[PDB]
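Notebook p. 47: complex prediction with adenosine-5'-diphosphate.
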Amino acid sequence: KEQNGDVKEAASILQELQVETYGSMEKKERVEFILEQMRLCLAVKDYIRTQIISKKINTKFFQEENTEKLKLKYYNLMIQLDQHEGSYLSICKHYRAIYDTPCIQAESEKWQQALKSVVLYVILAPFDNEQSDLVHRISGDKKLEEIPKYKD
Amino acid sequence: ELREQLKELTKQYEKSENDLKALQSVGQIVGEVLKQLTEEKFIVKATNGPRYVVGCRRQLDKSKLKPGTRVALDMTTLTIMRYLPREVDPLVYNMSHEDPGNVSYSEIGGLSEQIRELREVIELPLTNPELFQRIIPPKGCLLYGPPGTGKTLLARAVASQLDCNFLKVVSSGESARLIREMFNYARDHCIIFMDEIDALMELLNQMDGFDTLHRVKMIMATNRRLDRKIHIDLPNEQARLDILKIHAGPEIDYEAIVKLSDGFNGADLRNVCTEAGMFVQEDFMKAVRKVADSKK
Amino acid sequence: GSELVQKYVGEGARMVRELFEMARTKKACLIFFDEIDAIGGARFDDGAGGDNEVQRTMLELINQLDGFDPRGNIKVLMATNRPDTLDPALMRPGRL
Amino acid sequence: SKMNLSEEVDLEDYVARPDKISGADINSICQESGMLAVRENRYIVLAKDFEKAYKTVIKKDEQEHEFYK
Amino acid sequence: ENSEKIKVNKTLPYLVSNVIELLDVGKCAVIKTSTRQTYFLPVIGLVDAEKLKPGDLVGVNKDSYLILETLPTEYDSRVKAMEVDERPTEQYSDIGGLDKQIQELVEAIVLPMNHKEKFENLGIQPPKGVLMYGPPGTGKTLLARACAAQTKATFLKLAGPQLVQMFIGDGAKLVRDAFALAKEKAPSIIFIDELDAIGTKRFGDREVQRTMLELLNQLDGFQPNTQVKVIAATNRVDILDPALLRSGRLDRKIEFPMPNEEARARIM
Amino acid sequence: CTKIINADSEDPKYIINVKQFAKFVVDLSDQVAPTDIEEGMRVGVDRN
Ligand SMILES: Nc1ncnc2c1ncn2[C@@H]1O[C@H](COP(=O)(O)OP(=O)(O)O)[C@@H](O)[C@H]1O
Ligand SMILES: Nc1ncnc2c1ncn2[C@@H]1O[C@H](COP(=O)(O)OP(=O)(O)O)[C@@H](O)[C@H]1O
Ligand SMILES: [Mg+2]
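Predicted complex, structure tokens below:
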């Protein structure tokens, strides 16, 4: 339905699958279903339902073997949500999780862009104790290297 | 030889001299602060009963001694020398102070309808309560019908499913007061399980229903806010086979057994294996003979 | 009868034990528990939880009169004007 | 007022209807309606929710023996 | 010379004390002096901290209350004389009427006691606790005497009021001594007559309740091994501490019935 | 005396219970025959 150049009625159908209670194999298939519910919600711009559905996931699970692309898309979707909402420190934290993902560590740009956006989203937050702590943590981090006219 | 000899003799000399050192250490008096007088004074009740206004050792710091803080009172000057953790008395696990303890989820073979119902009962509040705040999460529920066929087992499995550990309690005036008092630690430890409500000349145990940190719920269960009713059937339709199999720690035989056995739980299979042992597969008709023999 | 209901919970049971020990010390004994309606009627508690020490010494008297122990040449002539509130444990003819 | 409600959820047509409910009853109606709304997974309650809670805690005083009346 | 100094400072009027609780700050102690008191100690003292488990008989200096020599064991005379000095001998077949009850008790007591491995060989649980609830006069103590006679092992005669000493904690000490004696003398059968005297339902009274909870806790301490099997006996089970008859605890209810007609013929 | 502590061969190191007061471990003083204690024989004891 979503492929069929029509989306207003796309989110509705899939926003009826409680893969939490459907009683399936393990936390792979249902994580995928929840994430596609979320993707459809973002596509239709239903941010309240986006947050509510995202609350169904437990990020602690993503410390597992195959849990790489699923958590990557999880954080990317949360980041779309927050970017259209207005928060910036939350977007910082989400990019930080993306960067800390072991797979994301590999390949040059897959971490260079992550750190670029992490630093900008630290900078684009209000001056609070939390923002100051994040500024300190991202400060240098060794790997921040001397990205030209950037770490300065 | 010198290395080991001198190593062991150094151990022995150090131990002996430290024994002499210990021989000049005086014990303290174990007691609890009561009221925290002017910040240089505390009313402390020693174990044997007597209560003294006592000092506060400077390096000890303050604000860590509040009414009930075990302290090591100085034996003569009666000064609070250094605090202590709360002693664990036998009145903890018998007072139902157990957070952990679970067996499995597959241990409950069938029961799918009640599993799903209680799941929808207790998950969402332990997980997202903000949705409700957008109003009051349900607090209690009921497990009902026959003697709650696998009531505590239902809790034992679905709590593990939800990842919140446990707070079990039995309901078999002072007792009521303290049962509500340890609610502080209960929340500090979730699904609360005040079971055995039946069997009541007690009147302070009323449903006080205080306010605690959001999340954490209860499944208060009995027979005959908290708005649920999980009716249960003492047998199952065709899950007696299932109960036997998932209890078969030790199948046509399993059918032939359930086809005439009508009990309430896996005690049937427990008796099967037990009497077969008196008389691992190779049992077969022995189970049938048991189930025919059990009286109940 | 009144020298078996003291304060100091357990003292009464200790008294019963000492009496039976003295009996066994003696060659042939006749005990004459009188007014035993004071020492032990029923066993139900309800509000009698505070008066359970007498019940306890009565239980000690039973276990002495007959239990996992030969009693010896000890013969008991209990007296009671009302053997209608006595405990069936004490009344049962293994002891009387 | 504390809850979040739609625009077609007028309460003024849940009062004019004769009914011998009390304050506890009305609190229960509202709490049950919100609970049912969340169960059916919406974050805004609606007239159907209030109808269902109304009938859930108005006719609850039933299952009596009818020969008494 | 340091050893001589320690010897000179180890005079021998030590006070017997417990080790109720332990802590690390180094090692410390929270000993409970028999002179009913609770004394904390920073430097555990001459004890080499052999894991110093909560619960132990330690010789402790009278005034400094420092842990001097540790004592091996202490079982009051009331539990040292509390065993079958002369094993009785009545019979097994000479207990009329009750047949299913006697068979059930024989299995659930002796068979796990003799053929221990050929119970768990089948994934079986030989329940530790057998409660004989009967109407007064059925013969519960008769079957108990028969088991003590023809069962070997070490038999413990627990006698209800025998656990209710006036002094606070002495009853719990007596129960601890009884259970420890059972464990040391394993295989053991622990027959508790008139269990309605250790603790009935509620609550000196708190002392009786505390000794009851000592019984409950140390019974729970059992595992399938630790070859001690407990057989409570009791006349009036007027809902006697439902917590007592729970999972793990006394859980084989050997109900005792009144003698039927054939039973009475056999009895006569 | 409730436990003669196995007597450790030499240096018996008796034990005693003064009942409500306390439970002490004790030696023998001036006693001619340090065997006549019988492990329950209601022995003598000094104050301090
Ligand atoms: N679905 C099941 N799978 C395995 N065992 C079960 C099941 N249901 C009940 N049982 C057994 O029945 C017993 C019932 O325990 P519990 O529910 O606490 O007591 P009651 O059923 O009398 O309330 C448990 O010990 C358990 O071994
Ligand atoms: N079933 C029985 N078979 C044989 N003797 C019995 C039986 N029941 C009671 N007795 C007689 O009574 C006594 C045993 O009953 P007992 O065990 O003392 O009862 P309880 O357990 O209620 O105290 C013995 O004197 C025995 O001779
Ligand atoms: Mg259960």
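Notes: DSSP finds two helices and no strands in chain D. The CA atoms of residues 58 and 64 of chain D lie 14 Å apart.
Next step: compare against the earlier run before touching the bench.
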